[PDB]
Write a protein that binds this ligand. Structure first.
Ligand SMILES: Nc1ncnc2c1ncn2[C@@H]1O[C@H](COP(=O)(O)OP(=O)(O)NP(=O)(O)O)[C@@H](O)[C@H]1O
Ligand SMILES: Nc1ncnc2c1ncn2[C@@H]1O[C@H](COP(=O)(O)OP(=O)(O)NP(=O)(O)O)[C@@H](O)[C@H]1O
Ligand SMILES: Nc1ncnc2c1ncn2[C@@H]1O[C@H](COP(=O)(O)OP(=O)(O)NP(=O)(O)O)[C@@H](O)[C@H]1O
Ligand SMILES: Nc1ncnc2c1ncn2[C@@H]1O[C@H](COP(=O)(O)OP(=O)(O)NP(=O)(O)O)[C@@H](O)[C@H]1O
Ligand SMILES: Nc1ncnc2c1ncn2[C@@H]1O[C@H](COP(=O)(O)OP(=O)(O)NP(=O)(O)O)[C@@H](O)[C@H]1O
Lengths: 313, 313, 313, 313, 313, 313
C-alpha cells in the first residue's frame, strides 16, 4: 500500500516543503499550535505533515487524539461535535498541553458551517486545535484565516521528489531507469500520491521500470507520439493523424480531457513560432470547451486534427 | 437472452482481453485479490470477467457472496452498507479466505462517496474486496487508484467478436449471412452487449439474418444511403440531398446527434482525399457543436448539406 | 497590538460613521439609551462605538459595568444571567442612571434565545441596556427590532479610513507612500482590523511602506505583475506571458477564479482605450464562464493569453 | 385576511376604475350582461368587480351561481363543463333571467380551448354568461373579443390606494406611519393584492408599521441602499459597490432579475441628467438580457458596476 | 353580434376577393366542387365564402348538410367520421348531387391525419367534398394540394372594406367620420373580424365615431403620439420619452409586442433617411427578440428609448 | 392527361431507376416473380414499373389480370378477396404461368391486415403474386419483407428526368428553354407527376416555355425577384427592399419560414464571395431561429433586410 507505508513519520521526513516545515518545526520546540491552515494542490503533503506534525508532538500517543475527517460531507460537522467534547475534556496523556483535529476539503463549505469552528477556538485554545486543509486559501472566508497561521504547499520540486522516489525503490528492490524516473514525474504533476501510486503499479509488474512502462501504466502518450501526431497533422496527412490518435487512444485509453491535456503540453513545448502556437492553443481552448459542454469526443478531436491540417499552406 | 446465456463462465472464456486475464489468472492460483479497478469502453467485459473472476475462485458458491450494484444511484452507497456487514462477517463457505463486491459506473460519483470505500478496505482486506468498473481511469480520484490493482479493457477486435458471435449462433440455430455479421458490427461499435442483444433481436424474428434485418432492428441508416447523400450533396444537388436526409431521418427517426454521428463515420470512410475530408470534418465539428448548444436541428443539418454543395467547384 | 491600542476612546474618535455617531451623540447629552441594534459588515466599528458609547457615558468607570460577550456560543445566554442580576442591582457609581451589555453575533441565534432578552428589557430599562451587533438587521426577529433603536454601519468609505490610517502613522513614525496607502485599502476591503493589522505588519519591517511592501505582507499578486503579464501578452510574446502567469500562479497559488478576478481588475484599471477594453472583458467574461462550467483551468487561461496575442495587429 | 375581508361588496365599492364601473353600472339597471372581457394589470380589480358585478345582480344569492376558476389549468376546461350544464338548466332563483362564470388568466390558452366557449355563448345567452380576465386584450384571439363587451382596467393611482389602505387600517386598529404607507406602495407596484397582503403581514406582527417593517416583510432593498450603491459605483469605488450589492443580495436574497429591477427603478428616479441616465439604462438593458439568456449573475452584475465606474471621468 | 349578423349570405356578398369569388362562381353554374383549399390571413373570408359557397348551392337547406369543424383539435378527426357516413349516405335533398364539410386550421396537423382525408375523396367525390382552410398553402403536404382546387385569400383591399364598413353603419345608424373609417383600417390590418368587431365596440358607446374613439377601443396609440415619442426620443429627451410611452401604455394598455409593433410602423413611415431608419429597425429587431425570449418589458422598452437618445449626436 | 399518356409501357421505358429495373429485367427472361416490395418517395415510379412489369410479361393481355388497389382503405382487403379467387383460378391466357396484384400505400396498415396476405402467398405462388408499394421499407412488418424481393426507388436524379422531360416535349412540339427545364425541376422535387403535370400546364398556353412561365404555373416566387430584393437590399435601399418583400409576400402569400427558405436558396446561389455569403447565412440562421421561437415575422424579416443594408460599406 505504498502511499501509506511511506507516510512520513516526522516533519523532517516530509519533503519539498522546506518553506512550510522549516517554520512548522519552530512550533514543536515551543509546543505552540495555533489553528493551522494548509493550502495547496492535492497530493503534496497537507495530510502528511498534518500527521507528522501531530506525530512529532505526541511521540507514540498521537493516534489516540488526532482524527482526520472530511469537511465536505455536510451533515456531520454537527455529528462529529461529540468527538469535540470528549477530546477537549481529555488532557494530553504524558506532559503536553494541547490537542489536534484535521479537516480535509475545508474549502467546500458555504459561509455558515465555517463559523461553528469559532466557538471551540476561543473555548479550546487552552486544549483543542484545528488544521484546515484547502485547495486554495482564497476560498476560506476571512473570519477563519483570521484565526489561522497559514501554510501554502507547493507542488513538490523535481529533485526532492526524484530523491524520495529512489529511496522508495532501493528499499523495495525495484529497478527504475533514469528514463522511468523523469517520466514518473512528467506524470506526477508534482503530486506524490500520483507518483508513488504509479511507481507501485509499475513495480507490481516485471522488473525493469522503463520510461514506457510508466507512460503505459498511467495511460499517457509517449511525448514522442503526441508531437508526432501533432506534426503529421500539421503536415497535411489528416487520415494518418486520425489513425494515430485512435491507436493512441486505445494503447493507453485516455479520456477526451486527457488527450486534450497532453495535446496542450506538447503544443506548448513544440519549438514552433509564438505566432502559430497561438492559433493552435486558441482552437484547443475551443475544443476543450466543446467537450466539457458534452459534445462528441471522437468528432471534436478529429475535428481538431482537421483544424491543424488546414494550416498546411 | 443470449447476452447472458453466453456470459463467460471462466476467466479462460472471456476473450480479446489476454492483456488483463493473463495476469488476472495469476490471482486465482495464489487466491489473492486486491481491490480491482476495471476500466474501459462499455461492453468489453468488465462485468463479465468480474463475474468469471468471482466464478473461478468460488466454484459453485459465487452467487451467494458476489453482488453487483450500480454505483451511480447516489442514495444507496449507504443503503447497501448493511450488505457490507453480513457479507464481511460470513466466512467464504468451503475453504477460501476472501469475498467480492462489484460496482458498475464508479466514475459517476463526486469525491465524497468515493472515500466511504476506504473504511472497509483496511477493515476488510482480510475478508472483503471491491471491483470498480469505470469508463476511464482518469475519472476516479487518486485515493482509490491508490488501493487498486488496475486493468484497462480494450475494445475487442473485429474477428474475435465475429467468431464469438457465430458460436452464439451455430449453438442457437440462427442463420446469419456474411452481410449480417459485418453489419452486426458496424452496429456493435465494438461493444458486445449491443452486438449480442441486437443479434438476439434478429434471431427472435423469422429465420435468415440479413445485412438489413440488422440495420432495421437497431434503427440505423444503411451506410449506402449516407454515402449516397453525402455524394449527391457534393455533386451540387442540394435540394436532392435535403430530400434524402429528410426521408432518411424519418425512415429510422434518428436524433441530430445520431445523424451527425453516421455523417462522420461515412465521411471518414469515404475514399476521398485527405485534403477535402478535412474541410468536411472541420465543418461537421462545427455543426455538431451548434446542435449541442441547442440550435436548430433541421437548419444546421441542411445548412451543412449546403456547405458540401458549395465545394462543387 | 494596534487594532486595540487604537480602539477609539470616544464617539468623536469613531470615523466614517457620522450617520450613526452624529445621532448616537444625541444620546449622551440626554443620557438616554434604548437598546441599541448595531448592524453592518464586520470590522466597521460596532464593537468600537459600542465601547466609546459606553466610554462617553461613564467617564473612567466603564470597564467595571460594560461586558461584551459573544451571543452565538449557545449554552451561555443562560449562564451569563447571574451577571445580569449583580449588574442590574448595582447603581452606576457616580451620578448616572443606567448600564450596558454588548452582544456580538446576535444574528446567529434561532427565535427562542432572542426572547429571553425581553424579561430584562421592561424589567431593566430603569437600570440595564443591551447593544446588539449583527451582520444584517433582517436576521433579527421582529419582536426585538421592536424594542431597539437601530443603527446601520456602512463599510468605512475610502478617505475616512485613509485619513485615520495616516493619523495611526504620523503618530507612529512610519512612512507610507501614496501607493502604500491606496494599496493598504485594496487590501482592507473597507475593514479596519484587516487594514490596521496589515499596516502594523509593514511598519514592523524596515522603513518606507511601499505599494509592494503591502501586497507582500498580506500575500497577493503584485498589481505590477498582472499588468505586466497582460501587457507582454498584448505585445505578442505568448510563451513569455504563459510563463509569467504560471510562475505567478504558484508564487501565490491562486484559483482560476482568483486569477480571472485580478485579470479583470487590472484589465479595467489599464489606461487603454474604452474600445479595446471591451474586447478584453467580453472575452474574460467568456473564460470565466468556461471555468465555472468546469472546463480546464490551465487551458482556458493560457487560451485567453492566446486571445490577447492575436490583437497584436 | 384583509385582501378578502375588504373585497368590494358592490360596484360602487370598487375604486379608481370609474372608467369601467360607470358603464358597468348601466348593465345592472337593465339587467343585461354580454360576455365580459376584463383586461388589465394584475391586482386592479377584475376579480373584484367581477364579484361585485355578480353581487349587485343577485343580492344575497350570488355564491350559489357564480364560480371563479383559473383558465390556465389546461385539462379542466372540459372537466368543468358539467358545471356548465347544471348551472345552465337552473333558473336564477328569485326574479332574474341570467347567470355568470368567471375565468381568470384566460390569456394563457392557445387558440383551441378558446373556441369551446362559443357553443355555450349562443346556446346560453338566454341563461349563461362568461367574464374573461386577461393581462392584455391583444392576447385573446379575435373570435372571442367578437362576442365580448370589453373593459380595460387601469392601475389604480397612488392616493386612491393610499386612502383605501388607511380605511383597511383604521378599521383594523393598525398603526401605519406615513413612511409605511408610501413604502407599502413602492412595494405594491399599483397592485392591491400585493399591497393589502403585505400590510396584513405587517399587521400580524407587533404594532407600529414602519417604512422598514414593510421593506422587510416583502424582502426588498431599502431604496436608500440602491441609490447609495449606484452612487458609490459612479464615483469610482468599484470594490466598495461590489461589496454593497453582495451584502445587499444576501440581506434580502434577491434574484438577478430582482436586483436588475430595482437597479432600474432607482436609476430612473435618480436626479441625474437625461443624458447619462440613458447610458446607464441602455447598458442595464444589456445586462438584463445577458442574465435571461442564462449568463452568469455574479459576473454580469459586478460587470455592470464595473460599467458605472468607468464613467467616473 | 355583428361579425355574424353580417356573414355574407351569397358569394356576390363576400368582398375584396374577386380573385377567388369570380372563379368560385363558375362552380355554382356547373354545380361542380372539387375539394377546396382556402388559404390566406385570418379574418379575410375563408369561413365566410365557404358558407356563402355552401349557401349558393343549397338555397335554403345548407345548415342541414354543411358542418364546420376545427381540424387542430387532434383526437376528433376520427371522432367526426360517423358524421362522414350519415352525411355521405344522405342525398342532397331537392335536386343537387353533392355535399360539403369545412375544416378550419388544417395547417396545424402533422402528415398522418392529413392522409385520412383521402379515403373519402375517391370514395366520396360522387357525394362528399371538403373545404380546407389554412393560413398558408405551403404548410399542407402535397398529397392534398394534389386533390384540391386552391384559393389564396388576400387581406381585404382598402375601398372594398371601407365600403362594406359603411353599409354596416348606415344600416345601424352609427356615425363614423372619415377619420374613424381610415383609422378603423389602420387597425383592421385588412382583417374584417378585427374591423367589424372594433366598429361594433365604438358603436356600443355614445354616438359620433371619431379617429380616436377607434384608436382607444383597440388600444393602439394615435399615430401622432408614437411619432412624437420616437421624435422626442431622438431629440435626446430620454426622461420625457419614457414618460410618454408610460402614459401611452396606460391610456390604451398595450402589450410589449403591441408597442413594439406600432413602434415599427411609425419608424417605417417616418420620413427620415434610409440610412438611420436601418439603425432604428435593426435595434427594434433586437428589442422585439429580447421580449419574446421573456426578458423585461419595461426595461427593454425604455432601454430602446435609451438607444434612440444616444444617436442625438 | 400527360401523367398517364406517358406511363411507361415497358421496363426499358421507366427511367432513373436502373438500380431496380436492371435487376427487375432478370425476372422477365426467367418469368419468375416473387412478391415484389417497391419502396421509395412518391412519384418515382413504383406504380409505373409495377405496370410496365406486368406489361412486359403479358404482352397485350395485362389489363385483364393485373389490378391496382389502395391498401389503406381499411375495410376492403377482405372485400377484394373474391377478386383473389376468380383471378387465382384463371390460368394466364396464352403461355405464362403466373399473375399479379398491386397494392399502393401498404405502409399504412397495422400488423393484422398484413398477415392476410400470407395465406395466398404459399397458396398462390404457383399462380398469384403481390406487388407492395410503400413509402419506407422499415414500416412493413418483418413477416412480409420475409417473403418479398425488395426494391428501393430513389428520387429520380436530375439528368434522367431532364432527358425524359425533353422526349415528352420534342414529341409534343413544345419549346422549353434551358431555364424552363432547370426551373421545371426546382419545382419537381424529383417527382414526375408534379413535373410532367406542370410542363403540361405551361404547354397548354402560348408557346415558348420560360423559367418564369414555369414558376408562375405552379405559383412560386420568381427566383429573379428574390435575388432582386436581396440585391437592392445589399445596395442600401432598405425602404425599397422592404417594399418588395411586402408585395412579394402577398403576391404569393408565403409564410415566414417560406420566405426565409427562398431567401436561403437565393443567398446560396448568389454569385457573391464565399466570404460575405457566410455573413448572410449566419444571420439568416439567426432570423430563422427568432421566428421559430415565435418572435415577429414582419419585424425580424425587415430586420434582416436591415442587416443587409448595413454591409453597404
Ligand atoms: N510532501 C510529501 N513528502 C513526502 N511524502 C509525501 C508528500 N506528499 C505525499 N506523500 C506520500 O503520499 C501520500 C499522499 O499524502 P498527502 O498529500 O498528505 O495526502 P493528500 O491529503 O491526499 N494530499 P495533500 O492534501 O497535499 O496532503 C502520503 O500518505 C505520503 O506518504
Ligand atoms: N470481452 C468479452 N468477452 C467475452 N464475452 C463478452 C465480452 N464482452 C461482452 N461479452 C458478453 O456480452 C455480455 C456483455 O459483456 P460485459 O462487457 O462483460 O458486460 P456489460 O454489462 O455488457 N458491460 P461492461 O461494463 O463492459 O462489463 C456479457 O454478459 C458477455 O457474456
Ligand atoms: N381596484 C380595486 N378597488 C377596490 N378594491 C380592490 C381593487 N383591487 C384590489 N382590491 C382589493 O384587493 C383584492 C385584490 O383585488 P382584485 O384585482 O379585484 O382581485 P385579484 O385576485 O387580487 N387580481 P385581478 O386579476 O386584477 O382581479 C380584492 O379582493 C379587493 O378587495
Ligand atoms: N371577405 C369578407 N367579406 C365580407 N365580410 C367578411 C369577410 N371576411 C369576414 N367578414 C365578416 O367577418 C366575419 C369573419 O369571417 P371569416 O374571415 O370567414 O371568419 P374567419 O374564419 O375567423 N377568418 P377567415 O379564416 O379568413 O374566414 C364573418 O362572419 C363575416 O361576416
Ligand atoms: N421512373 C419513372 N419513369 C418514367 N415515368 C415515370 C417515372 N415515375 C413516374 N413517371 C410518370 O409519372 C407518373 C407518376 O408515376 P407513378 O409512380 O406511376 O405514379 P405514382 O404512383 O403517383 N408514384 P408512386 O406511387 O411512387 O409509384 C406516371 O404515371 C409516369 O408516367
Amino acid at each position: 500500500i505504498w502511499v501509506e507505508k511511506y507516510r512520513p513519520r516526522t516533519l523532517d521526513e516530509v519533503v519539498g516543503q522546506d518553506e512550510v516545515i522549516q517554520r512548522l518545526k519552530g512550533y514543536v520546540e515551543r509546543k505552540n499550535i495555533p489553528h493551522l491552515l494548509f493550502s495547496g494542490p492535492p497530493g503534496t503533503g497537507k495530510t502528511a505533515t498534518a500527521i507528522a506534525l501531530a506525530r512529532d508532538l505526541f511521540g507514540e500517543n498521537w493516534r489516540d487524539n488526532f482524527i482526520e475527517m472530511n469537511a465536505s460531507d455536510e451533515r456531520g460537522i454537527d455529528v462529529v461535535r461529540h468527538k469535540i467534547k470528549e477530546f477537549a475534556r481529555t488532557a494530553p496523556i504524558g506532559g503536553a498541553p494541547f490537542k489536534i483535529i484535521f479537516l480535509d476539503e475545508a474549502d467546500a463549505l458555504t459561509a455558515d458551517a465555517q463559523a461553528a469552528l469559532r466557538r471551540t477556538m476561543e473555548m479550546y485554545s487552552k486544549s483543542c486545535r484545528f488544521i484546515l486543509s484547502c485547495n486554495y486559501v482564497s476560498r476560506i472566508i476571512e473570519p477563519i484565516q483570521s484565526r489561522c497561521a497559514v501554510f501554502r504547499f507547493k507542488p513538490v520540486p523535481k529533485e526532492a521528489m526524484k530523491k524520495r522516489l529512489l529511496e522508495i525503490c532501493e528499499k523495495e528492490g525495484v529497478k527504475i531507469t533514469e528514463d522511468g524516473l523523469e517520466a514518473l514525474i512528467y506524470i506526477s504533476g508534482g503530486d506524490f500520491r500520483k507518483a508513488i501510486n504509479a511507481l507501485q503499479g509499475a513495480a507490481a509488474i516485471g522488473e525493469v521500470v522503463d520510461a514506457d512502462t510508466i507512460y503505459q501504466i498511467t495511460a499517457t502518450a509517449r511525448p514522442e507520439e503526441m508531437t508526432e501526431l501533432i506534426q503529421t497533422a500539421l503536415k497535411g496527412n489528416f487520415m494518418e493523424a486520425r489513425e494515430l490518435l485512435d491507436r493512441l487512444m486505445v494503447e493507453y485509453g485516455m479520456s477526451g480531457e486527457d488527450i486534450v491535456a497532453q495535446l496542450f503540453r506538447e503544443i506548448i513545448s513544440m519549438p514552433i513560432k509564438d505566432s502559430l502556437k497561438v492559433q493552435l492553443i486558441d482552437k484547443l481552448g475551443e475544443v476543450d470547451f466543446r467537450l466539457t459542454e458534452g459534445a462528441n469526443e471522437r468528432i471534436q478531436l478529429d475535428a481538431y486534427l482537421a483544424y491543424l491540417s488546414t494550416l498546411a499552406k
